[PDB]
Design a protein around this motif. Structure first.
Motif, PDB file in Angstrom:
ATOM      1  N   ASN A  85       0.952  -1.146  -0.074  1.00 23.69           N
ATOM      2  CA  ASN A  85       0.036  -0.001   0.023  1.00 23.69           C
ATOM      3  C   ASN A  85       0.877   1.270  -0.079  1.00 23.69           C
ATOM      4  O   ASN A  85       0.594   2.108  -0.833  1.00 23.69           O
ATOM      5  N   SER A  86       1.795   1.339   0.892  1.00 24.86           N
ATOM      6  CA  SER A  86       2.690   2.608   1.027  1.00 24.86           C
ATOM      7  C   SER A  86       4.084   1.932   1.536  1.00 24.86           C
ATOM      8  O   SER A  86       3.957   0.914   2.269  1.00 24.86           O
ATOM      9  N   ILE A  87       4.942   2.834   1.697  1.00 24.31           N
ATOM     10  CA  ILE A  87       6.288   2.685   2.311  1.00 24.31           C
ATOM     11  C   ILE A  87       6.431   4.012   3.020  1.00 24.31           C
ATOM     12  O   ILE A  87       6.578   5.255   2.585  1.00 24.31           O
ATOM     13  N   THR A  88       6.936   3.638   4.423  1.00 24.57           N
ATOM     14  CA  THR A  88       7.125   4.872   5.212  1.00 24.57           C
ATOM     15  C   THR A  88       8.307   4.638   6.169  1.00 24.57           C
ATOM     16  O   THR A  88       8.732   3.271   6.202  1.00 24.57           O
ATOM     17  N   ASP A  89       8.983   5.584   6.707  1.00 23.48           N
ATOM     18  CA  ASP A  89      10.131   5.595   7.544  1.00 23.48           C
ATOM     19  C   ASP A  89       9.936   5.693   8.826  1.00 23.48           C
ATOM     20  O   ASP A  89       9.089   6.584   9.393  1.00 23.48           O
ATOM     21  N   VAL A  90      10.770   4.904   9.943  1.00 23.40           N
ATOM     22  CA  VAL A  90      10.598   4.945  11.170  1.00 23.40           C
ATOM     23  C   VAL A  90      11.491   5.329  12.400  1.00 23.40           C
ATOM     24  O   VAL A  90      11.644   4.915  13.344  1.00 23.40           O
ATOM     25  N   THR A  91      12.639   6.016  11.503  1.00 21.25           N
ATOM     26  CA  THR A  91      13.729   5.974  12.280  1.00 21.25           C
ATOM     27  C   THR A  91      13.646   6.514  13.487  1.00 21.25           C
ATOM     28  O   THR A  91      13.234   7.955  13.529  1.00 21.25           O
TER      29      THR A  91
END
Ligand SMILES: [Mg+2]
Ligand SMILES: [Mg+2]
Ligand SMILES: [Mg+2]
Ligand SMILES: [Mg+2]
Ligand SMILES: [Mg+2]
Ligand SMILES: [Mg+2]
Ligand SMILES: [Mg+2]
Ligand SMILES: [Mg+2]
Ligand SMILES: [Mg+2]
Ligand SMILES: [Mg+2]
Ligand SMILES: [Mg+2]
Lengths: 63, 151, 52, 102, 117
Positions: free
Chosen positions: E96-102
């Motif tokens: 669905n989507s790609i996101t960053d969690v750093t």
RNA sequence: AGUAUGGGAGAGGAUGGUAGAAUUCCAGGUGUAGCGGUGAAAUGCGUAGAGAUCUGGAGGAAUACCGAUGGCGAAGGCAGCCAUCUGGCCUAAUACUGACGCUGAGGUACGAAAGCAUGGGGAGCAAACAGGAUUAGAUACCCUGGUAGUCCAUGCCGUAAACGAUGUCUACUAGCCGUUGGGGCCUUUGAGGCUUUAGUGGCGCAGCUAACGCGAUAAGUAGACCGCCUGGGGAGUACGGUC
């Protein structure tokens, strides 16, 4: 980030767009800084060097 | 070298079969410039192998060569004081050269009376799928497979 | 600048919620200082998010 | 390591000198052992039949297993002094080379 | 047993290792894989090849429930950040989507000291 | 040199409260093999359920982006946000005092970090210390843990490459280009162009310098006062005395 894929969006193109967005954001670069402790003297030295470099680039630009 | 691009030399086709591949194989067999004895050895081996099964000797040779040719190899890269064996693809010329060298060396290490007999035995063994050249091919695949991880 | 002018404040905030530099916004230093103060006050009052 | 020591007409050589040189050189350089396969020392007197402060030249050249052969020279007033100077210089050179190559 | 229509991918990428965890919403886990677990021990543990291999195995294991949609959450630096997500799609999933969690500290705890290597 | 009245900028100082991010520890949901680290390893952690992931609590410390040849302070040095108390600075006109000034032997106050005394706190980091590696050897560099300390309150300590290595005050002596806080003028298309002043930068004529270089923020041309030097070691040492 929060990039939403389009109906016809290829996964590779979505990954490319995510990479560009992350590069513009610069969040990745901040992480590398936290690996080590930078002492105030080193921090000030690097900042002054960067300022000198920016001013030199400017002078070269309008020159 | 550090410069230039040396061109490859031309090997004339063999008399009987008019095959440049067979001429190159004879050159691999040849020692001390005794190319006449080299041809005698190779042709005796080819006749011996033809005796076992009725097929074209040239086709049999090229099929066995394809059986024995390699796929992938590593080239040692010295970075950070470590071997870093990195798998890589190899050009067809190198493929053929290593295949021929392995065949000839395996034949040399076999244990028949004459070089023709033991070369024919090696060709038969490679056709079957069990030989020293087959083992070196297997080993190179195994090692390049263990080290696939690096680019 | 006021912490209540949320639209104007959001004009100078990135998607992550970070304060955009004066270099690329084109604002004066005096304006930038007040902009940052108002942004911080609005963040505290929850009119605008801290992050993300 | 095999030791091959040679002198000139001025210096005068003997099997006693051979044994002593072999023993001392092995004792000093015993640590490296397999790293090194050959030593050759050479002795001369330069202005033979005269004298001076140095007046004698010692050399030692060693082959390390792997890297290329390395040589050292020294000048001194006596054979023992020349040998000691050459030994010290060899030790320093080998230490530097081995630290470099790690 | 339980069937979930939607999933979540968590890709924890580090200099040394890469870990892929396929979960459902609310955080309950379905499957997991690691580059070291899929062989590739040593310096090769950090190679992006091991990342995509681990992604392949984890996605194939988690495909049993048949979920056809998932969202990717990528954490940390190191190789595999892109190879793992490419392998997720290669397995047959639809992201669905790609996101960053750093995690970014706001000047909190003191980092360790330099390595004078 | 100073006083009264209007405005302006500011991480100047002290006290109290409060916001989010992240780390550690502790419980629970899912889940079953590795995690972690390195040049490569090993020590270490985990089938007594580790790692990853979600939820819920405890406490400590520091304030991402803004942020800058930026700002403030005598110096040391000062970084979220709000309130209280408080010092200095810049800028305009008018009105006052009439040399009330500069420097300053002694003296006195402030003075990074480490260290010390008493009582609290302790997340992360980490002198000493333990193990694992490398090495001929490792009393180190690297990895795994870790005590004092780093934090708070009240005192002491008087030291730094405490550095533009350049004492304070005053007047004069080509120009060009930045930036910060005010003042003034003219165009206007709601923004610009010129000037004066107080800071902070880059070049550069003359002049100075052994040279490098300095050059209206002088290391130039002059004046007032103070501190200090007389070849390298022995030596910031011994003796005596003060703290
Ligand atoms: Mg001579
Ligand atoms: Mg002679
Ligand atoms: Mg005074
Ligand atoms: Mg005094
Ligand atoms: Mg340590
Ligand atoms: Mg206090
Ligand atoms: Mg005091
Ligand atoms: Mg002093
Ligand atoms: Mg200082
Ligand atoms: Mg001084
Ligand atoms: Mg003393």
């Amino acid at each position: 980030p929060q990039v939403k894929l389009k109906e016809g969006e290829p996964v590779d193109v979505a990954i490319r767009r995510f990479k560009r967005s992350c590069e513009k954001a610069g969040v990745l670069a901040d992480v590398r800084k936290r690996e080590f402790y930078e002492k105030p003297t080193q921090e000030r030295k690097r900042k002054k060097a960067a300022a000198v470099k920016r001013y030199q680039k400017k002078l070269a630009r309008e020159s | 070298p550090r410069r230039r691009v040396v061109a490859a030399r031309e090997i004339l086709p063999d008399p009987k079969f008019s095959s440049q591949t067979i001429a190159k194989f004879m050159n691999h067999v040849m020692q001390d410039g005794k190319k006449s004895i080299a041809e005698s050895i190779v042709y005796g081996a080819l006749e011996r192998v033809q005796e076992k099964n009725k097929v074209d000797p040239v086709e049999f040779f090229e099929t066995t060569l394809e059986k024995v040719r390699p796929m992938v190899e590593v080239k040692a890269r010295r970075v950070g004081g470590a071997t870093y064996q990195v798998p890589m693809e190899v050009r067809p010329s190198r493929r053929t050269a290593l295949a021929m060298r392995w065949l000839v060396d395996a034949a040399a290490k076999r244990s028949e009376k004459t070089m023709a007999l033991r070369l024919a035995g090696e060709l038969l063994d490679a056709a079957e799928g069990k030989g020293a050249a087959i083992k070196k091919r297997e080993d190179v695949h195994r090692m390049a497979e263990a080290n696939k991880a690096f680019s | 600048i006021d912490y209540k002018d949320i639209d104007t404040l959001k004009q100078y905030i990135t998607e992550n919620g970070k304060i955009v530099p004066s270099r690329i916004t084109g604002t004066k230093a005096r304006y930038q200082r007040q902009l940052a103060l108002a942004i911080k006050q609005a963040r505290y009052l929850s009119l605008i998010p801290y992050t993300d | 390591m095999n030791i091959e020591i040679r002198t000139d007409k001025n210096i005068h050589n003997s099997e006693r000198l051979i044994t002593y040189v072999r023993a001392e050189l092995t004792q000093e350089f015993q640590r490296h052992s397999e790293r090194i396969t050959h030593f050759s020392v050479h002795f001369s007197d330069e202005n033979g039949d005269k004298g001076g402060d140095k007046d004698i030249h010692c050399m030692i050249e060693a082959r390390p297993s792997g890297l290329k052969p390395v040589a050292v020279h020294h000048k001194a007033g006596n054979i023992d002094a020349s040998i000691h100077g050459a030994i010290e210089k060899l030790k320093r050179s080998l230490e530097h080379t081995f630290e470099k190559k790690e | 047993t339980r069937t979930v229509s939607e999933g979540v991918a968590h890709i924890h990428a580090s200099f040394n290792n890469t870990i892929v965890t396929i979960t459902d919403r609310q955080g309950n886990a379905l499957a997991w894989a690691t580059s070291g677990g899929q062989g590739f021990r040593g310096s090769r543990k950090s190679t992006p090849f091991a990342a995509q291999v681990a992604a392949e195995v984890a996605g194939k294991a988690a495909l049993d429930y048949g979920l056809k949609n998932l969202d990717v959450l990528v954490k940390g630096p190191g190789p595999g950040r892109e190879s793992a997500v490419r392998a997720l799609g290669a397995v047959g999933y639809k992201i669905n989507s790609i996101t960053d969690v750093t995690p970014i500290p706001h000047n909190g705890c003191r980092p360790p000291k330099k390595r004078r290597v």
